[PDB]
């Protein structure tokens, strides 16, 4: 089965692009990364940095996770990211997404692997 590490890459890494090209980046990417198979994944973030740069976030600023765990790390620097959010009208299997491109810090939970 897909490891947690493997699933992260799948659902959030997009190192082939410096930023969301168009208003359709999310529609395109949710489908291709397979996030619309049983349902429309309501929200998702794609990060456009190299995987070493994202793995490295795990040796950066330790912060509490949302759920209170203590294995979250915030990047020191802002990163190129694309925010995908399912629209009001999005009805499965015609999953529709609002694409928002921005530079921001990311917080991720890290585990040993």
């Amino acid at each position: 089965k897909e490891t947690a590490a493997a699933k992260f890459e799948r659902q959030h890494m997009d190192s082939s692009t410096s930023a969301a090209s168009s208003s359709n980046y999310c529609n395109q990417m949710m489908k291709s990364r397979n996030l619309t198979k049983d349902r429309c994944k309501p929200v998702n973030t794609f990060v456009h940095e190299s995987l070493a740069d994202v793995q490295a976030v795990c040796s950066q600023k330790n912060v509490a996770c949302k759920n209170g765990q203590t294995n979250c790390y915030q990047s020191y620097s802002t990163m190129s990211i694309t925010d995908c959010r399912e629209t009001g009208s999005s009805k499965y299997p015609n999953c529709a997404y609002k694409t928002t491109q921005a530079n921001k810090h990311i917080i991720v939970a890290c585990e040993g692997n």
């Binding site: 992260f8 990211i81 917080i107 991720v108």
Partner: peptide
């Protein structure tokens, strides 16, 4: 080492 497993949030 340590790898990212969940995306908690941005900014």
């Amino acid at each position: 080492p340590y790898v990212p497993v969940h995306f908690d949030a941005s900014v």
